[PDB]
Symmetry: D2
Subunit: 330 residues, 4 copies
């Protein structure tokens, strides 16, 4: 098993922790955050979106005991002091949002970890990987990024469509759940003014991490795709609305068949496929990072189509963080 330390116990850190409980290949052995262990235990035990933790959580001597296993709890501000080697950590899930460059994330390796996976898009040239788009390009790097949830939805779908029909150009929108960066009522957000406005009251235009990341994980599409977001008052699950022009003419049935074939074969567990009358809550807990909604999309003609794909922006991305941890450990 791969021993993992989580740095940062926010939404991603906690859902990564829960996802790792259900996997035999990865074992969380340590968590670092500026939260007391008893408060960590509370945040783990109770979740408004995903329900009660499936297992036992004890606090003993400042550490967590989860399903009888001891999890080392620390509260280090400087990752260089984390002594990851003292708990045999192989890979660090870097989930604070604060260490998205090589120089900052490398402190985990100085502290004894072997590799680091950033749970967000890198801010320098640290390479990004998206399962179903470019895991096979990984080349042994000791620090990597799993991109972002929206990129994990867009890229697998864009790859199937491009590989089969040729994307000339495309624009996308994600209609995106409210997240922790937003405000409950109009409040200060000096670097993103719209993003300070009351989240439960508003449709809020925003920028998406996918516009900059998708051409990095699929270089053949660089400069051919961009987009934006609308944040809306739901607590989880988002949807990509991808408008593409195709080089090869394809009927909507042919598009469905290509997506379905990828979902049942090469991209199984990454790309999903449904023909049901689904809505966003039907993907709360979804592990696939891109679930194609066949009935929701619409074609104007054989070369211009709007495609719809769902993603649980918490669960899918967290599971693929673990997939990236496993992949770089092979």
């Amino acid at each position: 098993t791969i021993k993992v330390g989580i740095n940062g116990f926010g939404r991603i850190g906690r859902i990564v922790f829960r996802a790792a409980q259900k996997r035999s290949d990865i074992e969380i052995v340590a968590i670092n955050d500026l939260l007391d262990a008893d408060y960590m235990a509370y945040m783990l035990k109770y979740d408004s979106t995903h329900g009660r933790f499936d297992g036992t959580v004890e606090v003993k001597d400042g550490h967590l005991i989860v399903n009888g296993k001891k999890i080392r709890v620390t509260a280090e501000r400087d990752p260089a002091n984390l002594k990851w080697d003292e708990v045999g950590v192989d890979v660090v899930a870097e989930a604070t949002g604060l260490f998205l460059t090589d120089e900052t994330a490398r402190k985990h390796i100085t502290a004894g970890a072997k590799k680091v996976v950033m749970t967000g898009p890198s801010k320098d040239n640290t390479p990004m990987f998206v399962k179903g788009a470019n895991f096979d390009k990984y080349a042994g790097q000791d620090i990597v990024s799993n991109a972002s949830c929206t990129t994990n939805c867009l890229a697998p779908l864009a790859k199937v469509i491009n590989d089969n029909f040729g994307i000339i150009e495309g624009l996308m929108t994600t209609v995106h759940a409210t997240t922790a960066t937003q405000k409950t009522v109009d409040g200060p957000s000096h670097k993103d003014w719209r993003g300070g406005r009351g989240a439960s009251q508003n449709i809020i235009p925003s920028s998406t991490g996918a516009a900059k990341a998708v051409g990095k994980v699929l270089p053949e599409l660089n400069g051919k795709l961009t987009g934006m977001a609308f944040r809306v008052p739901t607590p989880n699950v988002s949807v990509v609305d991808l408008t593409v022009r195709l080089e090869k003419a394809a009927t909507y049935e042919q598009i469905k068949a290509a997506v379905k074939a990828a979902a049942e074969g090469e991209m199984k567990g990454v790309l999903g496929y449904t023909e049901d009358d689904v809505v966003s809550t039907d993907f709360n807990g979804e592990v696939c990072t891109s679930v194609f909604d066949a009935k929701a999309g619409i074609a104007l003609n054989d070369n211009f189509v709007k495609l719809v794909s769902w993603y649980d922006n918490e669960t899918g991305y967290s599971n693929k963080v673990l997939d990236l941890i496993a992949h770089i450990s092979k």
Copy 2:
């Protein structure tokens, strides 16, 4: 003064009523619905979205007294019995959703009205008129339709873009407020299964009335545009997300300049233009039916762009119902 009877006191009927109070050329003299006058008064006085009625509302002898003026109240199921001539009604705002064909709406003329404006898309070939798209094609018809709110947002924007740059093809999404056809918790909706799912919990894919209507008010765009909707948990205000391929190359600044010129000139009061960091609640009460959001849109290249335009689906549409009543009465 144009005397107007309102048939149906749902959301559109009540917001048309409020908007008519601010116009000197139109006076509401009668309302018909299966509601007691005291309940009509309550629904007019208090509005969760638009606040308290600006004026006085009294019930006297089974009728409404609004700002001191008597409004005749009736509860006729058959419009042929409405006796519109007894209150001097010129134009009926047909707002029940039940009489969207010539044969049904013409019962109002048999009942003494001179003209009818349907407050929804016609179900037969009753002509639709949308301000900023084709009011100038009106040619004396006594029964007309104002299309739908989404069509009133999309059509003025599509016209400016097509007239200046040529829309080869386009696909649109409206991210749309919850409406009265939706359900508070998962409930029966046998003709629209997704639409029965709990509105406050979900992003809900849906169809839009604008996909059929836009090519009818702008025949030059027939077959060139279609789209879909996502219903989201907000109570009012929606946004059109229009992705178009252009015949003539246009930079995003050139597109902005053209839209602003239309908003400040010919289409003033219909098309609006902003460069501010707006969110949906900033248009609660907006009278313009299409407010272009310059900063929210994004161009992939000089011939492929995503344009964003806001609309208060209650207020803008209701004001343009009144504009159409005035226009056909000239």
Copy 3:
């Protein structure tokens, strides 16, 4: 195995169905509602509040196949035509809200069922039974009512407090999730004007079924308790806020000890007890019909206290419908 037919596939009918899957003593063999089998299957499979159905759902020959078992589907408006004997139904879960009197519900017995459990308060003197209040008073009746969800929260708590300390008088509020009787935006509700106002926008004062029912299942408290509700914009889970004057002085720790003892002893699985920092979503899926929140309540003095108890108004009530079916079948 008790064979059960469900009449009405609304929220209670569908959550009773799901809960029955986890019990070996009760098997659903038939469902009646004015829904096609494929639409019933969709409503069972996908739930915005409770997630995807845990099992397989297929439609075969107009009937449902659930976890491999055939469920007879019918669409009879008149319960006398339900032919319950043809599927060996023992007890009917009468969940339509339309047959809450002896004369109407007894049509199920004419149609071949042996007993009926109404899933709402009876409108005549059909006896109500609430687990943790008066199941032990059941004495062979073939038609009974399980009262309402709020009554199932209030009555077990009121009984423990009254039995130990003596309720002289009490007043309660339930802060209550939105339900299907409410409206998504301000709409017609001529028999309950406040209840027509947009559910997601408002705190809405309302009446509660528990104000009439509690004195019926606990006659010793008749005339000693009443209350009201506020409906709020959550999709499920509600909370009782009970303010009582006590005959016998009791400190808050003594009250806690008494409630905990009942939750751990006689009323285990009915009354729950927590000292954790819980919020409403922590009870989405809760089977206990009354979970006492020790830290939320507050005592003014040893004879005047405010007690707080949570309930999943869908899940707890539905499970106790099944408990009542089992109890009357003993």
Copy 4:
């Protein structure tokens, strides 16, 4: 006119600013916060809850120009450096939540202001005042507190009830809108764990400032009243649910008459009175700090009653901050 400086441009500071625009007796001449003037202008111009600012807002040379009047903008962390005398400030509205003791708030007087009104409950013995409860006790103090919104709702009602009928003991609940201290999704709130849980998803038990403040502004009720709160997913407007035992027997009609008499006389503009079928949005913008809801309350008997009173927790409190400023300046 009284010249006022606002310290802190959060919800209270901004709604105080808007309220002062409509008053001739008070003129805002300066605002201090760590926000650029252009961002202050944006937060003032657009409000999700209260709509667009009624007036003009310009930014010039780092200062605000509002309806043509210059407002001095500063960004001082230490209030001792604010030079309030340079803009002739009489009274400071201390709205940061950070300076709720004599020693901290007195820095404004060192900086040249004459008096300070804290827009929250004091943390030391700085005296609190609530209009309709104890403004007439003000005795010239140069630093005062306006208590909190819930205390401004509870105290005027409790005073009428106690003065007329004698409160033996009472317990209250406020069902309270979401506020800026809450989180959009489950997040860190280490001093109030429940308060970190996702605000739009949950009913959240909480503590209320009124439990400690009400006996301070009405000493005759000290030790006779306390309570708690439930935070719910609405963006503004809250409601007090007051359960009281009365010394003097009073029918519910007698209680209504006493409240109505106070609302129309001595407490006019503080206590309001309605018999309408109201819901929370009907008080968005309400200036009265306590609006009694006659039809919502319920009496068990002539000495034990539940009373309901609404408050716009932003608008009412902000207007009474201005009232306190005017009162201490007499």
